[PDB]
């Protein structure tokens, strides 16, 4: 029934009770774990053209309102119940509803929350809820996408924030964001199949040229954005160089690094996810908020199918790279990281290293357990993906189930 | 497409699945409602006491259907040989309540079990395993000698080979043949006055029941423990294993020249010993296993875990690095040069050891000949990805299948 969750540093034990408010099922059953797998191999979102079943829809969102009034100490009020007839009524008569302003901005924080991937929910509670519903075409995204880049990155001061375009609507077109990120370095294919930049963005890189982009040939040029209105085709537009911060990478001891050129922005803004509460869905709801060092330093960097600049960097500390025992890529990936740290505290630029980070988690995890009984964590990605053990949450256990208000992965609109 | 687990490898955008998961026939502790694989000892394989005689019909299934994997293994499924062995095995239980396995059956069986373990990274050398059956082990003190003769076999004086040594198997209201310690080599853990532990904290438990039992402590750091064998129904019977027989490894760094003073160091042979073998429903309790080490099961988690050795702090501040704030990777560095260290130490010793770029390649290889052979492979990612360097290794970028299948290894209660 309730799992006994364990840390084996420390020794202690809790209980998890909030994974029984789950309503949603994951990949695992009895029989194999599939926890590792990055994406559903059915918990899709699929379609909309078609009503979501009223029966259905309608627990969802009574759910929600429930959740909502809860969180204000008004359950059961006079509002409480009116909100809920408000929510049958137009359900009943249009097969779908609305959210007030005041619920979106709850909404918002508790998906957030919600999150089992995500190791900065300690910073839940403080998000800037952007309602940008008022959204009728692409040029409106375009400016609305551009003041979240302003405020979210406040000169180097990061602030975590959300940009909420309209829900989706029965057969009726999504408003969509192709980038996966608004901020992303092209990736061009070259050669012999080889590529120059990001080879993470290849595909978004090419969908961009044929809408009439004019491509570079750096490794770290700036990708424009393709925002997509209802129905129409998608639309191409650059963001002003000023509105990009990005960070040039140099290290504190190793005079040489900085010549290898390398640089990454500022804002980490995911805008492919999908944004679930109450059974409303939101195809277009930009986050950001800042950057864990390791996600440059390790990932972006280090990958071998990235930047895979891991072997570059060893040569240039005259490693050993004849064998894999002289630990070269272990003490590569150590440096590249602490440049990342250096220099984004040199351009005074918000950023938190993987310790101070998981630190940070296990905090929440003990609020979240006096506040909720438990909190639904994914271990593979609460683990850092360099020094592992070193870090507090490594040695947490950890129950993973899906929460709502969520984020979501949604088909490429492509 | 498929109806099986679709199973992503993300550095190289290749797509396989797994069909072998079908073949499970025991349930782990994940629901479509929440995923419990993060637990290390989630109720679910754990081997609890059960004293009364099995279901025979519980037994009698789990039995044929490793017959059958054993005929299928030599290519003569359906033939008469295989009905003839599964006539025997039903009648024999039929008539005592249990069975007993061919010596090829053990040696089979016990292969499978480790070519089954999820959390081993190791299985590429699944194949090349050395079998000793001593089924006919009946004292505590005939343990030791057979203990004594895996070590030295096993050790091989650091050219290590595999070995497992498998015991009398359980039998109905008769004691367990066991081994109380966890490893066949485990340092000491010695309570203070203070309250911090000097030695292993891991072993504070094991090293009290020694003392419990007559042994006469000592208080050093790295004292090797004794051996409590237990034969069926007696008390434990202590043990010191001779010091010759116990190759250890003095700690040095390549060029910091001061990390030998230190005075660290590492045993060769990694042999867990208080697992249970399960084979056909049959239950070896005690099975004493080994291998070899990789590097980062000495340098990151047993010298540098918190609730371990934990000299991360130590050798950082040797290092002279700011040990007073978390953007130093003050933590991330040190633990390098300590697994650095090791292998190098080992090296230089000739001891065998597999660094973990090495082993996570070799295990790579692995999958990929398990999925021609059986369609798949049980693995434990958050176990089979190494404490440190994770995504600079191929397996982190490996999606994974978590499944149990038998023969298997299993935990079980602690005898005391
Ligand atoms: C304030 C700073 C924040 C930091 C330090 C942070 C850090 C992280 C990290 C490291 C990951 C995993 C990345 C990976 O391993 O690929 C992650 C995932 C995630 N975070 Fe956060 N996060 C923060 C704020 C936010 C905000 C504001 C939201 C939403 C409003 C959010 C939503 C998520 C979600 C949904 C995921 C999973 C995405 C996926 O499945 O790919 N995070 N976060
Ligand atoms: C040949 C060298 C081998 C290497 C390098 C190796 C390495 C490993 C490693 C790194 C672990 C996980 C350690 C941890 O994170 O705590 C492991 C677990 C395991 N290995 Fe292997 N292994 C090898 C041989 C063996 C052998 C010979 C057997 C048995 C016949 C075996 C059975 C297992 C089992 C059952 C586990 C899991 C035990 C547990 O859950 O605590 N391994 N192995
Ligand atoms: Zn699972």
């Given at each position: 029934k309730f799992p006994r969750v364990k840390n084996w540093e420390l020794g202690s034990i809790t209980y998890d009770?909030?994974?029984?408010?789950?309503?949603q099922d994951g990949p695992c059953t009895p029989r194999r774990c599939?926890?590792?797998?990055?994406?559903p191999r059915k918990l899709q979102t699929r379609p909309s053209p078609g009503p979501p079943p009223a029966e259905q829809l309608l627990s969802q969102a009574r759910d929600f309102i429930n959740q909502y009034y809860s969180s204000i100490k008004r359950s059961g009020s006079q509002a409480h119940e009116e909100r809920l007839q408000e929510v049958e009524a137009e359900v009943a008569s249009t097969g779908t509803y609305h959210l007030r302003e005041s619920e979106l901005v709850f909404g918002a924080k508790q998906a957030w929350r919600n999150?089992?991937?995500?190791?900065?929910?300690?910073?839940?509670?403080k998000l800037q809820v952007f309602?940008?519903?008022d959204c009728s075409s692409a040029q409106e995204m375009f400016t609305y996408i551009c003041n979240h880049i302003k405020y979210a990155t406040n000169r180097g001061n990061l602030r975590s924030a959300i940009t909420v375009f309209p829900q989706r609507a029965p057969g009726r077109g999504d408003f969509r964001i192709?980038?996966?990120?608004l901020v992303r370095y092209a990736g061009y294919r070259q050669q012999d199949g080889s590529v120059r930049g990001?080879?993470?963005?290849v595909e978004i890189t090419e969908l961009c040229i044929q809408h009439g982009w004019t491509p570079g040939?750096?490794?770290?040029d700036v990708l424009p954005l393709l925002l997509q209105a209802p129905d129409e085709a998608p639309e191409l537009f650059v963001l002003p160089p000023e509105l990009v911060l990005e960070v040039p990478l140099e290290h504190p001891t190793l005079?040489?690094?900085?010549?290898?050129?390398l640089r990454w922005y500022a804002l980490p803004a995911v805008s492919n996810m999908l944004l679930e509460i109450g059974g409303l869905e939101f195809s277009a709801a930009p986050f950001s908020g800042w950057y864990m060092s390791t996600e440059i330093?390790?990932?972006?960097?280090?990958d071998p199918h990235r930047y895979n600049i891991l072997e570059d960097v060893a040569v240039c500390m005259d490693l050993?790279?004849?064998?894999?025992?002289?630990l070269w890529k272990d003490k590569a990936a150590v440096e590249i990281n602490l440049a990342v740290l250096h220099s984004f505290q040199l351009a005074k630029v918000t950023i938190v290293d993987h310790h101070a980070a998981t630190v940070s988690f296990m905090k929440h995890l003990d609020n979240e357990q006096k506040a909720r009984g438990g909190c639904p964590a994914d271990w593979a990605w609460i683990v850092?993906?360099?020094?592992?053990?070193?870090?507090p949450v490594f040695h947490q256990e950890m129950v993973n189930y899906i929460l709502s208000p969520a984020f979501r992965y949604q088909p490429d609109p492509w």
């Amino acid at each position: 029934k309730f799992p006994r969750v364990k840390n084996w540093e420390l020794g202690s034990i809790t209980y998890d009770t909030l994974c029984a408010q789950s309503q949603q099922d994951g990949p695992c059953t009895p029989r194999r774990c599939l926890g590792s797998l990055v994406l559903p191999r059915k918990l899709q979102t699929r379609p909309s053209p078609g009503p979501p079943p009223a029966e259905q829809l309608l627990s969802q969102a009574r759910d929600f309102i429930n959740q909502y009034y809860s969180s204000i100490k008004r359950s059961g009020s006079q509002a409480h119940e009116e909100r809920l007839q408000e929510v049958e009524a137009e359900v009943a008569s249009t097969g779908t509803y609305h959210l007030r302003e005041s619920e979106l901005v709850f909404g918002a924080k508790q998906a957030w929350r919600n999150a089992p991937r995500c190791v900065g929910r300690i910073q839940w509670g403080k998000l800037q809820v952007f309602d940008a519903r008022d959204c009728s075409s692409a040029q409106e995204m375009f400016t609305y996408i551009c003041n979240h880049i302003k405020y979210a990155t406040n000169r180097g001061n990061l602030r975590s924030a959300i940009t909420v375009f309209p829900q989706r609507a029965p057969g009726r077109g999504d408003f969509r964001i192709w980038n996966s990120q608004l901020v992303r370095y092209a990736g061009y294919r070259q050669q012999d199949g080889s590529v120059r930049g990001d080879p993470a963005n290849v595909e978004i890189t090419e969908l961009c040229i044929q809408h009439g982009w004019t491509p570079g040939n750096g490794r770290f040029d700036v990708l424009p954005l393709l925002l997509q209105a209802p129905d129409e085709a998608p639309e191409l537009f650059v963001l002003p160089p000023e509105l990009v911060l990005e960070v040039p990478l140099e290290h504190p001891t190793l005079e040489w690094f900085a010549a290898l050129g390398l640089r990454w922005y500022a804002l980490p803004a995911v805008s492919n996810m999908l944004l679930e509460i109450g059974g409303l869905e939101f195809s277009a709801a930009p986050f950001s908020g800042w950057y864990m060092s390791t996600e440059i330093g390790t990932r972006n960097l280090c990958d071998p199918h990235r930047y895979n600049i891991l072997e570059d960097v060893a040569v240039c500390m005259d490693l050993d790279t004849r064998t894999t025992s002289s630990l070269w890529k272990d003490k590569a990936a150590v440096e590249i990281n602490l440049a990342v740290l250096h220099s984004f505290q040199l351009a005074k630029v918000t950023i938190v290293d993987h310790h101070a980070a998981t630190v940070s988690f296990m905090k929440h995890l003990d609020n979240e357990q006096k506040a909720r009984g438990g909190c639904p964590a994914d271990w593979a990605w609460i683990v850092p993906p360099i020094s592992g053990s070193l870090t507090p949450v490594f040695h947490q256990e950890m129950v993973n189930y899906i929460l709502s208000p969520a984020f979501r992965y949604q088909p490429d609109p492509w």
